[PDB]
Amino acid sequence: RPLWFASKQSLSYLDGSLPGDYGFDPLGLSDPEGTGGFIEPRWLAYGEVINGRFAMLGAVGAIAPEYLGKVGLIPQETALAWFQTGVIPPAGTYNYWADNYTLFVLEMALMGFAEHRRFQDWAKPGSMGKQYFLGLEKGFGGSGNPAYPGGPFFNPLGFGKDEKSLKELKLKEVKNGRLAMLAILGYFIQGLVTGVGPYQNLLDHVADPVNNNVLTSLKFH
Template identity: 90%
Template sequence: FDPLGLSDPEGPGGFIEPRWLAYGEVINGRYAMLGAVGAIAPEILGKLGLIPPETALPWFKTGVIPPAGTYNYWADPYTLFVFEMALMGFAEHRRFQDWANPGSMGKQYFLGLEKGLGGSGDPAYPGGPFFNPLGFGKDEKSMKDLKLKEVKNGRLAMLAIVGYFIQALVT
């Protein structure tokens, strides 16, 4: 599915590599699956009385950065935002390096965790004890089936997020 013609799997017609688009679909699907659950969790937990009412907000009201000092964190919200951007930037940089040179991130020294980061050679599915602690997909057939399920669930989660956006606009 490429309505804008950004890639050309048959030759050099497009300017985005199809492998990069497939990789992006897997990564964005994972974020969408986390976001779909995370968007409704505060409301559900608030209705069950498991979290304070002031934090049991609809998802579209939680993204506003509150004035400094509203919540009791170790720093003000702007410092937390910059800290989060630095950590996410580091993780995304390493992820891109692994896409450009598959398997390279498992070989570099990283706080003594290299053994757990050693992966499958496919950057979208890093494998290793940290990313697959239960050992799913032991053979090729089951791994292929799990990959297909992940892509389908990711697509469904992306549509769920669109539904959340529409609901926020309508209500």
Template identity: 50%
Template sequence: MQRVAMTSNKGLGVRPSLPGVSARRVLRAPRAATEEEAVPAVQEEKKVAKYVEPEDTRWGFKPPKVPAIVEAEQKGLRKVNGVKKTGIWFGSEQSLSYLDGSLAGDYGFDPLGVYDPEGEGGVVNQDWLRNAEIIHGRWAMLGAAGCIAPEFLAACHIIPESTGIIWYKAGVIGPLSEGFHYWSDNYTVFLAQIFMLQFAELRRLQDFKKPGCMSEQYFLGFEGAFKGTGDPNYPGGPIFNFMDFGGEKCMFRNHRTPESLDEMKIREIKHGRMAMLAMFGYGAQAVLVGGGPIENLMAHISDPAHINMAGNLIS
């Protein structure tokens, strides 16, 4: 019987009592971990906690994010040349495979796959699309400010009211002009603008295909200023970066580092995108309502309950 009891105790994991030590103390004593078992425990502590999508009680359970977005968010929302990004907009496995955060203003947003290198062909490729967005944004920033400047300055009585005309009546669209006379008729001015812009855009296209080639072409002694930095999107130099942002000679101390220049690139593309939307809004406003942006803004402020988007659509 005693032998059977000892066998039963081994099956239950109970050790026989040692001299001078109670059985309860032996059962509670922790078992020392071996060296092989201790190593995995340390490694588990260093692992990064996986992202878990919280449950949205208002709209029901939200589907989990794709692994590429989870990985990007765990790494601090990726960085552009050392500058932390602010978020990812409708990213997917495919878009995050080529929008890797190396471009300023890249948030993984490409729902139509326009920037996807697998679908590029002809002149429409990643380099051209990137350059086109930046140039359109810069023109839009100039246009958005130029469309409202005459109207605003005339309302403040800084310039004569005869020159503070609405942007689409200033010769941009010939039939809508109100007879404001430049040095010639509106159509001649328009053709002159086309000729000068074509000259500038052809030089920009040449620099895009072969960065730095503008310094090899004669241009009234300013060839050295068009040498560029090797990146056609940011040519720099004494003309396009006359304040030397990102350089040691910049008058602003906070903008003398390459990181500050990268931050300004992100700000520029953000402002450019907003300006492109603003120009689209100017055009839609002119077609649906008429009048200039300043005039429409003042009318809305005077009667916001009736003069608004809903009221304009109903009327």
């Protein structure tokens, strides 16, 4: 069992039953002694799961259109960096079929339905397949585990039908999530420092590792 910067506090509760358990908690945040709001070790594992998943989509989709437009068929009108997409209007705003703000209201309504019902599987797991909802209720029952609900919608292919391969895939999801979470954090700081794009910065360092923006530390938009 690999232990990375463990402590007598961390090893007391970090048991190894949680997926990706490397025994790392110098701050003792998953400490089960004084549990209240959001400082619940189950909620913290769910937070890493969801943050890692969304960051996997983020780490891909932020550097995806820039590389795609560099060498690809999708037109160069839509090929920009993630910060020049209209996310940050002062960094560059592209005009879609809506005014950005209406895109936000529409996405808040959609994410509202999805995330509210995802939370109802955390507060009362199983209750999301009881009230009428134009069908769809069966797959919204869950497997009891909030971070791993499964079902016909979210796990139709049945990967890891046994507990062994399920554990291995869970271990893989945890480390992929941590990798992509550090990735989008790197995108944030690189777009803050380099200001040219997540992939344009990588190309500046590939053909020129002597560049080294660390010693540079100058920032422009």
